Amino acid sequence: TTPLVHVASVEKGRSYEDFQKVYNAIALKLREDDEYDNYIGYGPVLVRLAWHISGTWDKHDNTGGSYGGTYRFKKEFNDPSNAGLQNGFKFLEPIHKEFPWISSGDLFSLGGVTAVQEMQGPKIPWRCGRVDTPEDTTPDNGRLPDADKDAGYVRTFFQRLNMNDREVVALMGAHALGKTHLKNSGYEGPGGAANNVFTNEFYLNLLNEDWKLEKNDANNEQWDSKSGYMMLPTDYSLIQDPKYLSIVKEYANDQDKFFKDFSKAFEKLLENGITFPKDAPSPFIFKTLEEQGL
């Protein structure tokens, strides 16, 4: 029967100038709603949403992945256990109503892309063609990484997402955006000062901040800094593992190297499980709101 084949089918009569409009609507709503989560913005929750829906992918049976966009169905997410993402969705469906022609998968993939570029991040090529598939396909959770694990778990997990050491250290750079909410995951606190700005501060803190193993009120252990910063054990595992420790120090010295790598990785993650027919156009590169005078 072979693993599933998800083929990118572009929305009808839709080109670059259409998805740029959607991009803009996302980016402006980011700027209109700045009071979310003690003035952090919907930036972080949108980058996580894209990661989470692209993270259920399984290269062995080609199940899950961003293509499906089946995540609007309730069976998908338990809510909680993956808590915090219900805000990411409540941010997008008015934009889904402004543009009812775009597929769900395309939407919160673009939102994940729009969020980064607006948060001073690198420019990430994005593609259209992901199609909603709730019928017969609703990826069960438990496919997503636990927080309390280590470098062995991370490495063996991301190979399922077809990611090598370099890619997963790059994608972990996103954990400089936002914070952990104790009410959602069981961990509390940010791991950086700039929570709404895409930088390399992540790799800097790991190597330059001192960390103590501390319990939180949710009884789970974590690494906490003197500055008030924190890290997940999965994040802290990256300085524990020598192969991971090498790549970490590189992005700490060169931020531009990280921007090029995150772009390559984060795009790959979004396009995982999708076979693009050769008649499909080159990946879009969207202009930000700043370079449009806005």
Partner: protein, 108 residues
Amino acid sequence: TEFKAGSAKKGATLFKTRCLQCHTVEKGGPHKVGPNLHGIFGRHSGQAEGYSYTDANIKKNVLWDENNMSEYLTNPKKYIPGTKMAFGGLKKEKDRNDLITYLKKACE
């Protein structure tokens, strides 16, 4: 001046939920990722007493008053490129009208 001021209350959150992670408000305050922000009005483009500072900002050496520095928080990379000030920002005139009022008073 041409730039109004806001209430002395609401944006006190906008210093603690927004600018607290870097800037301190007290006399001789301990330096963080940002310098001790006090006496800022009437002082220079990055005095930064006892704190690491790139050349990219004292470039201008322009005083920080209510007027000249209203483009300071709208887009940092725009008014002083190559800097290390990285923050989300605010795009409405009210919030800028606000935060100055507390660092016009508590920064005396």
